[PDB]
Each structure stands twice: as structure tokens, then as C-alpha cells.
């Protein structure tokens, strides 16, 4: 039961149809910066049991619509729903710290709406939640987000299955989470330097969460 | 302006197929789910099914895997192909495109299961 | 399968009284609830989502509330235009089942 993990880990986030398993394993140690070793050995198999977001790292869900960046700047998001393991002050407020990162380094303002009609919706939801894209359960993929444009796309949706907090003591920060998908939907895709906001894998930092891989990505779009 | 048209026959007979399409335009499919709901005339609303936006499907338990959806995100359309239909099929289908609700409807067509 | 029933099941008032339907779920639904408002030979119109908020070009009368298995519709002062058959929906769980609908009349 460990060769059927990789073969899960590597369908689901794109390596298997892009690519024996040894070419798989090696795009994926490549893409995830570990040792390119070619064998499903421990380095590889500890990243895959490691906590991640649950957007592909080569391709997309799906054919998205539009060149997948925004094209205006005055950007409006709308929190649809809580989870219920933080004050909703402490949710709002993560969600408006984690978006000052990214006007911090762009022409692009976020203004929090009331209405269906935001091009960021943030969503909590458990397994199947609305989207064709169901959660996994405790642990796992911790959230997904999708490019710029209209309807599905923007939006932000975080695995409620999880325990949300904000610092140290146990669970995932909803404020690093949520940083990290808001790159996402504002057009940027996974990086490879593990170090990077935009790295897959999640990884609890104090101090600045933006990497200048970043901010450089940010900007060929902005 | 988000529309949404159904078409296909409305006379159909008993333990045959039937074939709806719903073709789209203002919006993107691979950007909305699009839904199926049906009602028997002066009667309410049956929840049938989603084709959401990567393809996936789900379907109405109480049709017995009779019904099925497919779409074209090329072509704006969305396909709705039940088969083995009952006298109980009788009723007025419509695609809706789903975001947070459905807001925009078709216009509804009478599919009426007759010899 | 979530149930959704609604109450009353038809209702007769008089223009600029307050209405009130309500939609209870079998079970827990969060704020997934959304309300349509059908009149006759047309589709539905989106009315409520999210359990209180009010879709676009629809007037300050219709309000919604409730959160995980009651809900209620309410207009606070029916219009004449307003007849109709007005269903509840959920959308937390696959079927996403509809209310039985609750018609809506006039007194005149």
C-alpha cells in the first residue's frame, strides 16, 4: 500500500499524464525540488504524505476560460461561509491579511462585498462541496483555488475537514492557506523553490510569508 | 446576457430514449455548472442532475440510472440522454446554470411519454 | 436524501400584509438554502441564496433567513405581482432536493 499511493499522488496532480513509474517519479522529484532520484524512495514518499494544496502541479483541473488574469484592478472577494474552529473577527480578518500580501506588490485592491457576484468567493466546504473537485477528508489536500476570470473561476474553497487555526499550536493556518490560494487566484501556478509561497506543500512559517519567487511571478501579471 | 434553450422532442414513446439539448450563450460551461431539474405539470420541482465544470457528473438516485449528461464546452451545449422511459417521465425539463443558486433558467420544454 | 418541507402548503393574504413560508431540512444544511418564486407557464427565478441574501433586480420586500434546518422566506408586504409558487432548495449534499413549494394568493 505504498505503490498505490504514488500511483494516486502522481495521477492526481498531473505527472502520470504528462509521463514504469521511474519518468513519473522523476517529474515529480524535479517539480518538487527533491533529490531526482528515480525510485519511489523515502524523500519522495515522506512529500507525498506531506500536506498540500490541491491544485495540480503540471496541467489544470480542466480547460479554464480567458488568459487566466484579472483585468481589472479594484478586485472584490466575498467570504460565503465559516468554519466553525475560529471567531468569525479571527477568519475575516486572516482573509484580509492574507490578501494585503499580494496589493503589497501589484496594481490590484481588495475589497470585501456582500454578494454572488465577487470574483474571489472563499468557501468552506467538506468532500463534495459544490465544484466537481470533492475534498479528501482530515489531512491531505488542505484547500484548491482556480485562475481569474468568470464564475467558478477566482474562487478560493478550503477543506473544512481540517482543523483551522492561525499560529503554532495544532492545525493549519487559514492565514498562510489562504495566502498561498490567492495566488492562485490571481493567475499564479505552483513553484518549485520549497521556500516559496506558492510551493506546494505546507509548511508553517513565522515571518514573511511572500519569497522572491513570488513577487517576481506576481509580476509578470501584474 | 446569460441564455439558456432546451430542445428536442416532445413526443417520445414508452421504453425509448430521450435526448435534450440545452444550448448555452453568455456564459462559459467551462466556468458554471449546469443542472437538470424537471416538473410534472401542477406538480413540483425533481432535482435530476449536474454536469459540473471539469466534466464530472451526478445524477438523481430515484432515476435509476436511466439518465445520463454530457456537454460540448466548444459548442455551449449541454445534453441530457434518459432512457427506458416511463409514463412518470412526463413533465417539463430544464437546464439552469448553478452558481451559488440557480439564476438563470431555460425556458422549459414539455416532454410528453406516449404511444 | 435531505428532506425539505415546507409550510404552509398554499396561503391567501391580502396586498401589504406579511408573509411568511418556511422550509425545514431533515437535517443539518448550513446556509446552502436558496428560494425561487415560479409563475405560471414560466421558470423559476432565483429569489434568495445563501440562505439570506437577495439576488439582483429583486425588491427589499423579499427577505430570507435561517440557517441550518429552519428557514424562512418572508415578504413583508405582499404586492399584487407577487402570486406565484415559491420553493426552497437545498444545496449542501447531492440530491439537492427542492421544497414542495407553498402557493401564494390573493385576497381582494
Known amino acids: 500500500t505504498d505503490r498505490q499511493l504514488a500511483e494516486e499522488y502522481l495521477y492526481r496532480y498531473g505527472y502520470t499524464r504528462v509521463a514504469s513509474l521511474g519518468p513519473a517519479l522523476l517529474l515529480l522529484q524535479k517539480q518538487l525540488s527533491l533529490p531526482e532520484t528515480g525510485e519511489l524512495d523515502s524523500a519522495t514518499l515522506k512529500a507525498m504524505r506531506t500536506p498540500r494544496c490541491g491544485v495540480p502541479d503540471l496541467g489544470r483541473f480542466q480547460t479554464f476560460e480567458g488568459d487566466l488574469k484579472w483585468h481589472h484592478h479594484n478586485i472584490t472577494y466575498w467570504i460565503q461561509n465559516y468554519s466553525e474552529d475560529l471567531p468569525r473577527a479571527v477568519i475575516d480578518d486572516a482573509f484580509a491579511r492574507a490578501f494585503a500580501l499580494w496589493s503589497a506588490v501589484t496594481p490590484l485592491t481588495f475589497t470585501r462585498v456582500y454578494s454572488r457576484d465577487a470574483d474571489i468567493v472563499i468557501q468552506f466546504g467538506v468532500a463534495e462541496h459544490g465544484d466537481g473537485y470533492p475534498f479528501d477528508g482530515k489531512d491531505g489536500l488542505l484547500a484548491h483555488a482556480f485562475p481569474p476570470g468568470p464564475g467558478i473561476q477566482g474562487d478560493a474553497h478550503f477543506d473544512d475537514d481540517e482543523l483551522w487555526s492561525l499560529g503554532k499550536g495544532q492545525g493549519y493556518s487559514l492565514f498562510l492557506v489562504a495566502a498561498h490560494e490567492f495566488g492562485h487566484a490571481l493567475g499564479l501556478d505552483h513553484s518549485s523553490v520549497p521556500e516559496a509561497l506558492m510551493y506546494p506543500m505546507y509548511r508553517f512559517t513565522e515571518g514573511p510569508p511572500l519569497h522572491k519567487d513570488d513577487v517576481n511571478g506576481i509580476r509578470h501579471l501584474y | 446576457q446569460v441564455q439558456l434553450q432546451e430542445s428536442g422532442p416532445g413526443l417520445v414513446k414508452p421504453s425509448e430514449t430521450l435526448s435534450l439539448t440545452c444550448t448555452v450563450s453568455?456564459?462559459?460551461?467551462?466556468?458554471?455548472?449546469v443542472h437538470w431539474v424537471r416538473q410534472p405539470p401542477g406538480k413540483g420541482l425533481e432535482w435530476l442532475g449536474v454536469?459540473?465544470?471539469?466534466?464530472?457528473?451526478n445524477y438523481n438516485s430515484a432515476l435509476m440510472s436511466r439518465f445520463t449528461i454530457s456537454k460540448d464546452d466548444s459548442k455551449n451545449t449541454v445534453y441530457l440522454k434518459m432512457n427506458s422511459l416511463k409514463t412518470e417521465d412526463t413533465a417539463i425539463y430544464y437546464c439552469a446554470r448553478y452558481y451559488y443558486g440557480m439564476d438563470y433558467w431555460g425556458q422549459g420544454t414539455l416532454v410528453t411519454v406516449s404511444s | 436524501d435531505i428532506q425539505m418541507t415546507q409550510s404552509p402548503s398554499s396561503l391567501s393574504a391580502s396586498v401589504g400584509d406579511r408573509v411568511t413560508i418556511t422550509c425545514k431540512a431533515s437535517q443539518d444544511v448550513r446556509n446552502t438554502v436558496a428560494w425561487y418564486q415560479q409563475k405560471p407557464g414560466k421558470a423559476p427565478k432565483l429569489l434568495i441564496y445563501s440562505s439570506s441574501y437577495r439576488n439582483t433586480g429583486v425588491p427589499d420586500r423579499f427577505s430570507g433567513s435561517g440557517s441550518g434546518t429552519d428557514f424562512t422566506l418572508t415578504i413583508s408586504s405582499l404586492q399584487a405581482e407577487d402570486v406565484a409558487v415559491y420553493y426552497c432548495?437545498?444545496?449542501?449534499?447531492?440530491?439537492?432536493?427542492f421544497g414542495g413549494g407553498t402557493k401564494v394568493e390573493i385576497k381582494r
Open positions: 453568455g456564459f462559459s460551461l467551462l466556468s458554471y455548472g
Open positions: 432548495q437545498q444545496h449542501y449534499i447531492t440530491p439537492y432536493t
Open positions: 454536469i459540473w465544470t471539469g466534466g464530472t457528473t
